[PDB]
């Protein structure tokens, strides 16, 4: 009962992130939604809705391919999916090389840097916010 591939990516994310919470206390599914609302194209919105499904849920790149998602979309999701064998800097460098992933990752950083949603702030947060700021600047050069 799906009309468009953007609707499918939503239903996949809502199901996959069901039961997860972000560090602010809210349902995690609203993070890819808030990133998707910052996007400008349907391709960016699809990747934004799924950008944390491979890392955090049972969704795999293989599953997305078998569900009909195009090669450039899945590769764009993989460009914003960190591998353990790489540093965070090498991950952001790999994100910038992808036209769709670069834009989605920028909006992902913006959402993660939105401290207006948080209850407090600790020293562990500012070290994480700092590398977000460095990655945010790198992706805008």
Q: Find which of its own copies, Cl ion, Mg ion, none residue 82 binds, CB within 5 to 8 Å per kind.
A: Cl ion
Closest CA to 119 of 19, 26, 17, 20: 26
Site string for Mg ion, 76-115 (x = CB under 5 A): --------------------------------x-------
> Is residue 58 near its own copies by the rule CB under 8 A?
no
Q: Which two tokens stand for residue 67?
A: 């569900």
At 131, list the tokens.
Answer: 């590398």
**Residue 111 CB neighbour total at 10 angstroms:** 20
Comparison of 14 and 61: residue with beta carbon closer to its own copies: 14
**What are phi and psi for residue 21, nearest 5 degrees?**
-130, 150
d(CA 104, CA 106): 5
Q: Which of 58, 84, 85, 123 is in the footprint of its own copies by CB under 8 A?
A: 123
Question: Of these partners, its own copies, Cl ion, Mg ion, none, which one is at the site of residue 65 (CB under 5 to 8 Å by kind)?
Answer: none
Q: Which residues bind Cl ion (CB under 5 A)?
A: 36, 41-43, 45, 82
């Amino acid at each position: 009962n799906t009309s468009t591939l953007l609707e499918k990516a939503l239903q996949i994310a809502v199901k996959a992130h069901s039961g997860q919470i972000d560090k602010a206390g809210s349902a995690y599914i609203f993070h890819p939604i808030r990133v998707s609302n910052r996007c400008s194209t349907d391709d960016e919105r699809i990747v934004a809705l799924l950008h944390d499904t491979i890392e955090d849920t049972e969704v795999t790149a293989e599953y997305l391919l078998m569900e009909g998602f195009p090669r450039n979309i899945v590769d764009a999701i993989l460009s914003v999916t960190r591998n353990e064998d790489e540093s965070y800097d090498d991950f952001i460098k790999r994100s910038r090389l992808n036209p769709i992933g670069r834009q989605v990752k920028l909006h992902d950083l913006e959402d993660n840097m939105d401290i207006t949603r948080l209850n407090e702030l600790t020293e562990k947060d500012i070290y994480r916010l700092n590398k977000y700021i460095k990655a945010y600047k790198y992706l805008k050069e």
